[PDB]
Amino acid sequence: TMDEQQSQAVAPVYVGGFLARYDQSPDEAELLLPRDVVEHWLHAQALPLNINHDDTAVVGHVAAMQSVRDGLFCLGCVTSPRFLEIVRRASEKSELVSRGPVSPLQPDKVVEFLSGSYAGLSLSSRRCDTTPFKHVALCSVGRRRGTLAVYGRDPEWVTQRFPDLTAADRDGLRAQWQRCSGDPFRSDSYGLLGNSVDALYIRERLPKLRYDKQLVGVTERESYVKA
């Protein structure tokens, strides 16, 4: 049934990945975000999930944030029906999506389109020159390295993509996304299309994505990542 498959495609989609990696020296001072600060801020201060920092393009929320041995890791959830419907439609017209995923993964057009278009995570936080964390954005590539975005239909499965995380790590995350208003999306296809040309001119996009993939070890795992 089309309406059946279409409803399955538009179901929520989870996303996880590091917002920052402690062993990576940013190429810009404004991006410094050490463990001590992160952990302090975490103790003080649901954050919205949006497309490339556009507050009119909110597609969900962050379900969990956790500081771990290697960095600040987060798990979000794309819930906006309007956004998901747009993605569904576009996915139907992507040759990349048509080629499908690797090895034994089942094809998932929506998830795959998201993996390709917004392969990165970008945190929005107070400058380092209460609520320190403002929001998390899905983007073509993050400015901080190792911010690869991993999409999947199940939160456990997504967290399982990152070999650095420990069982303890996951419990801390699971606790959060289990504890955790209307479609918040206020943009449209034209908006996303407009945003797309911007992504085409970010220098070394792919090289950075591959680097992130290798750093976080999602390379040594199977996922929907297109980079």
Binding site: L19, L123, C128, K134, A137
Partner: peptide, 4 residues
């Protein structure tokens, strides 16, 4: 605020 800094956006990454």
């Amino acid at each position: 605020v800094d956006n990454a």
